Amino acid sequence: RRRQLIRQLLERDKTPLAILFMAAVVGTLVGLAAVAFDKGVAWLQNQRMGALVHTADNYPLLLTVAFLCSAVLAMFGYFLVRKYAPEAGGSGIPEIEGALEDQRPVRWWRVLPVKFFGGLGTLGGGMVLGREGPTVQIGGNIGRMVLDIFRLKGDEARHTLLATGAAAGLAAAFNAPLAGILFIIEEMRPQFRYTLISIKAVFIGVIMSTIMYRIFNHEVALIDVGKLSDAPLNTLWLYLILGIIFGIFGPIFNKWVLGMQDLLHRVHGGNITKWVLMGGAIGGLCGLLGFVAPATSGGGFNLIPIATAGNFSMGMLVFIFVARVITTLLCFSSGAPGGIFAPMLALGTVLGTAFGMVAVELFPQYHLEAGTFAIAGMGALLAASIRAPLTGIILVLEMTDNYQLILPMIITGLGATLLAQFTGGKPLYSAILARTLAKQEAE
Amino acid sequence: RRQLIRQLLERDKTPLAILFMAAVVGTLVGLAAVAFDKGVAWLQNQRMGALVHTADNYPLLLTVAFLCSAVLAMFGYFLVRKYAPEAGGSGIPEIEGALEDQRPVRWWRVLPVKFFGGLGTLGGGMVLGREGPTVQIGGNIGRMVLDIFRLKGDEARHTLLATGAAAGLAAAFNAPLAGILFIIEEMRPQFRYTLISIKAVFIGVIMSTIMYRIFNHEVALIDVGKLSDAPLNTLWLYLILGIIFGIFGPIFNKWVLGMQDLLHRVHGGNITKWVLMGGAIGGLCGLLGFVAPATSGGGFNLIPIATAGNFSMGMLVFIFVARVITTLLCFSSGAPGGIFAPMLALGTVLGTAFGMVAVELFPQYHLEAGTFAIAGMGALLAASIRAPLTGIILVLEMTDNYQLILPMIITGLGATLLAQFTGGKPLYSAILARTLAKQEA
Ligand SMILES: [Br-]
Ligand SMILES: [Br-]
Ligand SMILES: [Br-]
Ligand SMILES: [Br-]
């Protein structure tokens, strides 16, 4: 095959111009979509918080519409999915991953409006869910949409445009170009066989998407942590320790979300009315907690700069972490449209800060700042649950801009991946696709 | 489909043996990378110290700077021709090939050949990088332990050879990410599925980087500081720059290939004509590293000076052309040393040059030429060797200007784009093709 290789090596990196151009329009759309989604979630959340002012006196009545408003929006999201596109429930990343292995269909005519509006209700209701779920799945579906609309033929174009959709989808969710592209080549793409996914094209999609996001969200960081301190070579060993901790907790978390999917499936047994109702309950709880204990609800981005600064108590970091574990499970495993990605950053951040605290008082000769251990742990639950640390590490580096912590971030992350593996853990996404893929045959 | 379901449930379960052994590779590659890096400086120091004791008589030190770098050069071209011809030039294509199971990994030979051989050319002050030596050595290091510990399997044979190369590029730049990204964007088998463990590659890259940090910390190779930001209405300029890189990329790619031939004529294949030729190129690199050091040496030293807009337009043009010349002579003559680094220095100067024009053409953008330098720094790496992702993440890891991430991606993309629409090719793969086609013919 030596001669084939010589022919191949010279024909390397020659992507069809049509695919490059089509990647450019996919990105532009996925961007504007993700922007519009984000803008939408904000508006609804704004009106909700605007209602708690109209009834800011009668405290019970306050605690009433705080519940109802998030309930109505949740049900409307639980409904849109259970009725028109069941594949739009949950994250949506396993489903796109499935579409890459050619085992799940990309019914963009149904998912695009369902994921967009359904998620807009759940997210806009202030449920503990991310924007990644929608944006990624929506993005990939945009990639398929232009594929059928322009009728491009080829496995390259199908796999590529599907990938640059998800990539550009993740990019606009976090203003993180590199994280999006890296997500495709480390976790998204088929993991057991060769593939014709033009990386250069995935790049062009992300670029146009991120640019679109930059047109509308200028001069405000999703997370402004500020330039923290550094990490000495004799401090590193504390990060490997934090990693191990994440490493045994990852799989445990994985079992809970999987198990909670089952436990919550009983409550409705597949019935659309029981499910929708249960949705409004979970959503309403989040809207309630959104007023009385905001750190237990919401996406989680808000409490990240705070924890990293050490402005929470050790008691709070235990409160927030426990309660958020409970609410994250409730919102995601219930099948509501919305990613688990972002809330897992919060869990990691909180747990990291918790470690950093104890680490500070135990060893003042190190001159530690508990914020360094939070940033390290930020992308650590993305290493022991999702098992895509290279994505997490780069992502966190894109959102926090503290490169001088690249070693602890890596080391901790790898502490999580190695111990997740050894303790009997499996990637959260693939472990869900397999669940979905087995069920499809089980019946 | 059921095949997939089973595969999913078993995903990311790298054998502990492949893991534990990756940790030792990176260590050995790290320590070696450090020792290599030290020796090169030590030898540069001597030539610096020798120029002192013969300070007067300008024609005398023009001679001793020649000779010292002429002698060291010959010693390098010799240790390769006589003991490991495969350990000439870069070495990355060779490891790329070895990953395809299409080239041999003679670590018992290549390791001490590349090491001391590199020391002659690197420490001679020739326009070469530490990548080639480090990456290649690293792979051979990783191969050594595969042999030494007799690990059996394609996965094991592929992983350990990869992490070694990864942990070697890293320790040559203190860039842990770009090391891991080099393997999965360029180094690994580009046309068939392979069993390389990402997780395991990581472990190797760390341990190496850790070793490097033990011996080199607190001092960065390239310091630029925090440059200004990049307005959205200014972004198009980074596309124009990338386009310029995109058309020059292949043109340079031709010359680095063509000059290989034109130098192979000079010595025909003879070890004596070659070594003696290599000592002329090397001797020139020690000489030029005194009358205009910005035309010789690795090139890392002029980058911050370039970024800060300290040069003038003329001195930029001079340095560029001069370095275009001196780079080919060092690499296309098969001297042990990568071309990765001297392209960074080429891209930086070219970028600055473009930036210099931008500042005066558009004062309303309030531009700083340094931003274009950063954008264009890893643009040759994108338009020639065609690894923009690894290139960008590298530059980011060495300049810490994430605020310029959009211009850096735009430029690097417009380079990888226009290089394809002009018939350019992955230079590292264009070399392996050459070597693989000269073999079966
Ligand atoms: Br899901
Ligand atoms: Br998600
Ligand atoms: Br070479
Ligand atoms: Br090179």
UniProtKB/Swiss-Prot annotation, chain A:
Q: Where is this motif: Selectivity filter part_1?
A: 90-94
According to the record, the segments passing through the membrane are 17-53, 61-84, 108-125, 132-150, 199-216, 237-265, 272-293, 314-333, 339-360, 406-422
Is Cell inner membrane tagged as a keyword? yes
Name the source organism. Answer: Escherichia coli (strain K12)
InterPro entries, A to Z: Cl-channel_ClcA, Cl-channel_core, ClC
Intramembrane zones:
93-100, 161-173, 177-185, 371-385, 386-388, 389-400, 401-405
Q: Where is this site: Mediates proton transfer from the outer aqueous phase to the interior of the protein?
A: 132
Return the CDD domains for the record.
EriC (cd01031)
Single GO BP term: cellular stress response to acidic pH
Q: Where is this motif: Selectivity filter part_2?
A: 130-134
Q: What induces it?
A: By acid-shock conditions.
Q: Which residues lie on this side of the membrane: Cytoplasmic?
A: 101-107, 151-160, 186-198, 266-271, 423-443
Q: What is this protein called?
A: H(+)/Cl(-) exchange transporter ClcA
